[PDB]
Structure 1
């Protein structure tokens, strides 16, 4: 055994030892219990970043842990390969997105291997390969013929200078983020998944997910946004009917979740596109301008609640069907056409958004709910105004004194009796639009024929292959300019036809890849029935919180779609979910020509603990604030430099020790140095133990007759094993597991293990510590284990707790005062000559 720890000598040998043994190449062996540990697969962007290393180390700790406990562990990896990065890189470097992607994949694969992740590389997938995406084209066609996928005109943001469609996030004050040109709202046909048909199942099945973080479940509930409320029709006043046709001349229909407060409605509000808005605006330029500004808006959903709410009165009136109040119709920017009826009622006393709106425009506020003896203040919002549970009705006529549920039913009865309303259930969830006007994506398997319509491509003809011999130029989607791709014949009639040129939302590939890993080379379906039956669901999913809503909802949706197609048996893809925190790092700047700030990467910096300077010249730079690593402020630390400098095990240890997985991880040079030094300590501890005697049979069995000091070390040992096991398998906090092993080694350092029984206990401590740490730092632990013991580490398995090592000594002594029934003198007095060990006599 070499004296000094050298990661570059031992880490490749260890990786070849694991590959040669094929520990990670698993199959559907019905003998061991399966365990499917999955980390969210990466975009092949070019290189790993520190987020990648954190995620996949966390996955590897859990996978190796379960492996050591006798599970048949599948830990697969692959490439979410489609999307915009390759297209932009194609425009920058004038290369093909496919070629750029396959080079990135090959480089990033090497980096993953070098980190020693116990990954089943025989299950690798690359979603840009036809052998992958053909199966989502297949599923598309089946759902399309069922109407679960459908085509319909939608509205997009067109940038006329960049010639591409932009999301609301990419529109800044009505203009494209890169071009700066005013975007144009354009209606175009697009494809949609009818995800709303699965809304109730997607909502209710969250209750099955006892091992999901409650905040992720809450986020999905709010996103789905089910509500049980009331349709209410307010008759249009006789004086307000000019310009209206059909039912819009007869009544204004709204949806409310608070029909218990219908007595306190003080006005109503409609969307800009509402017919009442159009009729009122017909002769009022201020309304036409307000309608125009509403339509031109591009507010993102994550910002919808943070926008300034504005309205204009229309001079039109409707009648409350329960009290006869004549209420004015306002046009408001927060009422969305297409949500419900595009028209709401307002109760400023009991809805906070209505309270702020009314307060802005000095509109009436009518209290109709009371909660205890709390005073109602029409000029200040108190949180109890909106309480649904503990309130009773007031100022509501014959409805007074009722609670929410009884008021709901009474209003429902009153409205239904006179035909003015009925209970209704709504969802905020919109259908899923999957059409992208981009090249580097999965082709949509639709052929357009003027005789036959939009025709799904037959299963025989799938895939529709995306040509990879393309370099996008940034003047429109290349597929639309490629007659060699889109000119085809109709598969129903054989006539002249055109392929769809839009490609799929790349969320589609990540919505089912966890099933494809089960049988990645299966050529007769999305996933083979034998392999889906064996692996079932993912037992553990690990990934960033930014995917807590869309990706997970899409994946749960696809799983239920595939179940209903008979491809899988589960209702839910992910049993346990762990969400890792961000990786943050200090930023460094040095001002330049125009009173601004230029940003320097941390690896090109050296500190003086005073100030910092550039490593190349030694000239100062300004130390700035800490934030998530990104190209924005040039503060991303390349993990490849971390590996080159210290080795994979140090990288893995620093990530797991620095913070709990959910907590943000702060980059720290001293922290990285401390991780490496601990590995040197571990190395020297085993080396020094073997230098004074070599290996012995580890202590096992009855520990009677062991000295107090060695019994104490065995106690620390098996409590540490218990602590670590509970940290890996239950708390999923690996930092405290590392600290616990560090405490074991501390006590070992203070224990004389020189005797024959001492060496036996020392062997037992070390054999346990290297296995307890092997999930985190497998290369050095594999090497150290081979110096201590000849068995296969993974066949020795996870350390067992010896309960007997946790029972402490006992000795019953009789208490007697005057003859009748330091250490023991204090205990017996808690109930004086002492006979050692048997009796204590209290001279009374």
Structure 2
């Protein structure tokens, strides 16, 4: 054994040993219990940083723990390769997005290989390869003919100067990001997944996910946004019907989740596009100006909760069907034409939005709910005004005194008897719009024929291959300017036709890649039946909370679609979910000549303290704040530079030790140093042990006759094994597991293990320590193991707990009656004061000197004495 720890030498050797043994290349082996651990695959945008590394080290820790316990572990990696990163680089470096993507994949793969993750690289997928995306093109065509995928006009952000569609993230105060031109709201045909048809299933199946963080489930529930409410129709008054046609001349229909407050409605409000708004605005130019300002605004809910709610009265009136009140119709900018009826009722006394609205315009507030003895001040809003659970109705005639659910059910029966309303369920969830007007994405497998319409490409003709010899420039999608791509024949009639040139939302690739890993070379379907049946569901998923809503919802949706197609037989894709905390790091920059400032990477700066200078120009730089490690502020620490300086094991150890996995983790030079020093200590410990006599048979079995100090070391040892097993398996708290092993080594260091029995216990401790830590730092542990023991580490398995090592020795306690010694008892070291009392009262000499008299008091001195006063 070499005396000094040399990571640069032993880590490549360990990785080659693991690669040669194929321990991470797994099949569908029925002779082993399966375990599928999955980390969210990265966008191949250039270079991974230590943030990504924390995510993938956590998954590798869990994967190696399960492997040591005899599981058939699949831990796959792959590349979420489509999307805008490459398209921007194509404009920047004037390179094809495909070529840029593959160059990044190759570099990042070596980044990952250098870290020694136990990954099945034979299952690697890159989602921009036709062999992958053909199968989501396939599922698209199957769902299209079922109507689950459909085509309809939707609204987009049209930049007339750049001649491109833009996301809402790129429209700023109504103008494009790179243009500043007024964006036009344009209606174009697009493709949608009818995810609303699955809303109730997607909502209710969250209850099955007993091992998901509650916040993630809460966020999905709020996103789906189911509500149980009431459709309510207000008869349009006879004087308010001019210019109204059909049903709009008859009633105003609204949706409310508070039908128990319908007796308290004081006005109603309609969207600017509502037919009542249009008719009243006919002769009123003030109503036209307000309607125009509404439609010109952004309907995004982010801008709308921060929006000043405004309205104008219309002079039109409707009649409350429960009490006959004549209520004026207002046009209001908060009423959305597309959610429900585009019209709402207003109850200012019991909804905070209606209270503030009616406080601005001095509209009536009528109390219909009392909550105990709480006083109702019509000029101030109180949190109990909206309490659904603890209130009963007042000023409601038939309904007085009922609670929320009783009044709900009563108003439902009343309105249905009058034909003026009925219960209705709504969802905030909208259908999922697939279409993107971008080049670097999966082509939509639709052909447009003037005779046959929008027809799907037949399964025999899939994939529609995205051409990779393309350099986009930002003046519209290049597919729309390539007749060699879009000119084709119609698959139904054979006539001349045109391919759809929009591509798919790249969330599509990530909505099913976890099934593709199960059979990534299968060419008869998305996932082979035998492999899906073997691997079942992902046992463990690890990824950032930024994907807890959309990605997770889409993946759960695809799972159910694939189930209903007969491709898989699980309802849910991910059984356990771990959301790792973000790695954060200080930033640095300097102001550029073009006004705006540009950011400098940490490893390119030099910091002196008690000046911050650029490591190249030797000029000082700005030392700004600490935030999430990312490419935007260029504060990503490249693992490869850390590995060159300290080794992969030092990188993995720092990430797993510095913080609980869910807690944010601040980059620290001192923290990296503390990990290396521990690895030196670990190496030093095994070397000095083998120096002083060489390897021996590890102690096992009956420990009677072992010295007190060695019994205590074995007690610490097997307590540590139980603890680390619980931290890895149940708690998933890796920082405390490492601390536990460090405590074992501290006690080892304080124990004389020179004797024959001392060496056997020393062998037992070190053999356990190196296996306990192997999921965290497998390179040094693999090498140290082989110097300790000739068996294969993965065949020796996870360390077992010796329960006999956890039994402490028994105590002898004196039993006195009225202070005079009358007997002796033998008690457990863990015996409570009540067990000491019981054993003492049952001592022969105690009962023979208590003379049947009861005990007036019993003094218990643990470990020394029990005195029975009688």
Query: TM class, shorter-chain normalised?
Result: over 0.9
Cα 1:622–1:128, aligned 2, differ >3 Å: closer, same or farther? closer
CA distance, structure 2, for counterparts of residue 842 and residue 341 of structure 1? 82
Q: Does the CA contact (< 8 Å) of 1:228 and 1:426 recur in 2?
A: yes
Residue 669 of structure 1 deviates from its aligned partner by 0.8
Cα 1:595–1:580, aligned 2, differ >3 Å: closer, same or farther? same
Aligned-partner SS, 1:313: strand
Higher deviation after alignment, 26-35 or 272-281 = 272-281
Q: Write out per-residue CA displacement over residues 316-345 of structure 1, whole angstroms, 9 at most, x where no aligned residue.
A: 211111111111212222211111001111
Q: Write out per-residue CA displacement over residues 76-111 of structure 1, whole angstroms, 9 at most, x where no aligned residue.
A: 111111111111111111111111111111111111
CA distance, structure 2, for counterparts of residue 759 and residue 208 of structure 1? 51
Residue 201 of structure 1 deviates from its aligned partner by 0.4
Q: Does the CA contact (< 8 Å) of 1:714 and 1:761 recur in 2?
A: yes
CA distance, structure 1, for counterparts of residue 109 and residue 739 of structure 2? 31
Cα 1:349–1:840, aligned 2, differ >3 Å: closer, same or farther? closer
Q: Does the CA contact (< 8 Å) of 1:590 and 1:599 recur in 2?
A: yes
Cα 1:264–1:830, aligned 2, differ >3 Å: closer, same or farther? farther
1:322-341 correspondence runs (5 A): 322-341=322-341
Cα 1:617–1:482, aligned 2, differ >3 Å: closer, same or farther? closer
Q: Does the CA contact (< 8 Å) of 1:358 and 1:364 recur in 2?
A: yes
Cα 1:2–1:195, aligned 2, differ >3 Å: closer, same or farther? same
Structure-2 residue corresponding to 1:829: 841
Residue 708 of structure 1 deviates from its aligned partner by 1.4
Q: Does the CA contact (< 8 Å) of 1:518 and 1:535 recur in 2?
A: yes
Structure-1 residue corresponding to 2:208: 208
Q: Write out per-residue CA displacement over residues 265-316 of structure 1, whole angstroms, 9 at most, x where no aligned residue.
A: 1211111111111112222233222222222223433444233222222222
1:619-630 correspondence runs (5 A): 619-630=619-630
Residue 127 of structure 1 deviates from its aligned partner by 0.6
Cα 1:591–1:722, aligned 2, differ >3 Å: closer, same or farther? same
Runs of 4+ in 1 over 6 A off after TM superposition: 592-596, 818-844
CA distance, structure 1, for counterparts of residue 518 and residue 19 of structure 2? 20
Structure-1 residue corresponding to 2:830: none
Q: Does the CA contact (< 8 Å) of 2:259 and 2:411 recur in 1?
A: yes
Residue 356 of structure 1 deviates from its aligned partner by 2.1
Residue 167 of structure 1 deviates from its aligned partner by 1.8
Q: Does the CA contact (< 8 Å) of 1:169 and 1:300 recur in 2?
A: no
Q: Does the CA contact (< 8 Å) of 1:311 and 1:331 recur in 2?
A: yes
Higher deviation after alignment, 377-386 or 453-462 = 377-386
Aligned-partner SS, 2:38: strand
Higher deviation after alignment, 21-30 or 812-821 = 812-821
Cα 1:391–1:478, aligned 2, differ >3 Å: closer, same or farther? same
Relative to the length of structure 2, the TM-score reads 0.93
CA distance, structure 1, for counterparts of residue 819 and residue 386 of structure 2? 75
Cα 1:314–1:754, aligned 2, differ >3 Å: closer, same or farther? same
CA distance, structure 2, for counterparts of residue 386 and residue 233 of structure 1? 23
Q: Does the CA contact (< 8 Å) of 2:727 and 2:737 recur in 1?
A: yes
Aligned-partner SS, 1:192: strand
Residue 221 of structure 1 deviates from its aligned partner by 0.6
CA distance, structure 1, for counterparts of residue 601 and residue 862 of structure 2? 70
1:177 is the counterpart of 2:166: no
CA distance, structure 1, for counterparts of residue 24 and residue 472 of structure 2? 39
CA distance, structure 2, for counterparts of residue 90 and residue 836 of structure 1? 77
Cα 1:31–1:835, aligned 2, differ >3 Å: closer, same or farther? closer
Cα 1:835–1:51, aligned 2, differ >3 Å: closer, same or farther? closer
CA distance, structure 2, for counterparts of residue 530 and residue 843 of structure 1? 75
Q: Write out per-residue CA displacement over residues 567-587 of structure 1, whole angstroms, 9 at most, x where no aligned residue.
A: 000000000001111121112
Q: Does the CA contact (< 8 Å) of 2:555 and 2:573 recur in 1?
A: yes
Residue 114 of structure 1 deviates from its aligned partner by 0.7
CA distance, structure 2, for counterparts of residue 139 and residue 654 of structure 1? 43
Q: Does the CA contact (< 8 Å) of 1:230 and 1:421 recur in 2?
A: yes
Q: Does the CA contact (< 8 Å) of 1:175 and 1:182 recur in 2?
A: yes
Residue 514 of structure 1 deviates from its aligned partner by 0.4
Aligned-partner SS, 2:524: coil
Q: Write out per-residue CA displacement over residues 109-147 of structure 1, whole angstroms, 9 at most, x where no aligned residue.
A: 111111101000111111111110000111100100000
Residue 830 of structure 1 deviates from its aligned partner by 16
Q: Does the CA contact (< 8 Å) of 1:168 and 1:299 recur in 2?
A: no
Aligned-partner SS, 1:580: coil
Cα 1:819–1:416, aligned 2, differ >3 Å: closer, same or farther? closer
Residue 361 of structure 1 deviates from its aligned partner by 2.4
1:842 is the counterpart of 2:854: no
Cα 1:774–1:255, aligned 2, differ >3 Å: closer, same or farther? same
Cα 1:247–1:837, aligned 2, differ >3 Å: closer, same or farther? closer
Relative to the length of structure 1, the TM-score reads 0.96
Residue 702 of structure 1 deviates from its aligned partner by 1.2
CA distance, structure 1, for counterparts of residue 669 and residue 378 of structure 2? 57
Cα 1:519–1:597, aligned 2, differ >3 Å: closer, same or farther? closer
Residue 680 of structure 1 deviates from its aligned partner by 1.1
CA distance, structure 2, for counterparts of residue 250 and residue 179 of structure 1? 47
CA distance, structure 2, for counterparts of residue 714 and residue 503 of structure 1? 63
Aligned-partner SS, 1:360: helix
Q: Does the CA contact (< 8 Å) of 2:111 and 2:639 recur in 1?
A: no
1:504-523 correspondence runs (5 A): 504-523=504-523
Cα 1:300–1:664, aligned 2, differ >3 Å: closer, same or farther? farther
Cα 1:555–1:592, aligned 2, differ >3 Å: closer, same or farther? closer
CA distance, structure 2, for counterparts of residue 772 and residue 3 of structure 1? 22
Aligned-partner SS, 1:448: strand
Q: Write out per-residue CA displacement over residues 800-838 of structure 1, whole angstroms, 9 at most, x where no aligned residue.
A: 111111111103445245897699999999999999999
Cα 1:294–1:724, aligned 2, differ >3 Å: closer, same or farther? same
Cα 1:395–1:735, aligned 2, differ >3 Å: closer, same or farther? same
Structure-2 residue corresponding to 1:88: 88
Q: Does the CA contact (< 8 Å) of 1:721 and 1:799 recur in 2?
A: yes
Aligned-partner SS, 1:246: coil
Higher deviation after alignment, 389-398 or 625-634 = 625-634
Cα 1:633–1:526, aligned 2, differ >3 Å: closer, same or farther? closer
Structure-2 residue corresponding to 1:77: 77
Q: Write out per-residue CA displacement over residues 698-719 of structure 1, whole angstroms, 9 at most, x where no aligned residue.
A: 1111111111111111111111
Q: Does the CA contact (< 8 Å) of 1:611 and 1:623 recur in 2?
A: no
CA distance, structure 1, for counterparts of residue 697 and residue 756 of structure 2? 11
CA distance, structure 2, for counterparts of residue 239 and residue 836 of structure 1? 92
Cα 1:304–1:728, aligned 2, differ >3 Å: closer, same or farther? farther
CA distance, structure 1, for counterparts of residue 867 and residue 210 of structure 2? 58
Q: Does the CA contact (< 8 Å) of 2:269 and 2:335 recur in 1?
A: yes
Higher deviation after alignment, 801-810 or 63-72 = 801-810
CA distance, structure 1, for counterparts of residue 859 and residue 505 of structure 2? 86
Higher deviation after alignment, 566-575 or 239-248 = 239-248
Residue 359 of structure 1 deviates from its aligned partner by 2.0
Aligned-partner SS, 1:249: coil
CA distance, structure 2, for counterparts of residue 826 and residue 143 of structure 1? 73
Q: Does the CA contact (< 8 Å) of 2:720 and 2:741 recur in 1?
A: yes
Aligned-partner SS, 2:334: coil
Q: Write out per-residue CA displacement over residues 719-761 of structure 1, whole angstroms, 9 at most, x where no aligned residue.
A: 1111111111111111111111111111111111111111111
Higher deviation after alignment, 203-212 or 646-655 = 646-655
Higher deviation after alignment, 616-625 or 305-314 = 616-625
Structure-2 residue corresponding to 1:734: 734
CA distance, structure 1, for counterparts of residue 526 and residue 839 of structure 2? 71
Q: Write out per-residue CA displacement over residues 589-608 of structure 1, whole angstroms, 9 at most, x where no aligned residue.
A: 45677997654322222332
CA distance, structure 2, for counterparts of residue 786 and residue 546 of structure 1? 42
Residue 67 of structure 1 deviates from its aligned partner by 0.3
CA distance, structure 1, for counterparts of residue 731 and residue 277 of structure 2? 56
Q: Does the CA contact (< 8 Å) of 2:312 and 2:332 recur in 1?
A: yes
Higher deviation after alignment, 768-777 or 832-841 = 832-841
Higher deviation after alignment, 377-386 or 424-433 = 377-386
CA distance, structure 2, for counterparts of residue 363 and residue 824 of structure 1? 76
Q: Does the CA contact (< 8 Å) of 2:713 and 2:751 recur in 1?
A: yes
Structure-2 residue corresponding to 1:474: 474
Q: Write out per-residue CA displacement over residues 385-436 of structure 1, whole angstroms, 9 at most, x where no aligned residue.
A: 1111111001212211000111011111111111110001111110000011
Q: Does the CA contact (< 8 Å) of 2:587 and 2:633 recur in 1?
A: yes
CA distance, structure 2, for counterparts of residue 542 and residue 362 of structure 1? 52
Q: Does the CA contact (< 8 Å) of 1:171 and 1:298 recur in 2?
A: no
Higher deviation after alignment, 67-76 or 161-170 = 161-170
1:664 is the counterpart of 2:675: no
CA distance, structure 2, for counterparts of residue 43 and residue 836 of structure 1? 63
CA distance, structure 2, for counterparts of residue 252 and residue 836 of structure 1? 80
Residue 681 of structure 1 deviates from its aligned partner by 1.1
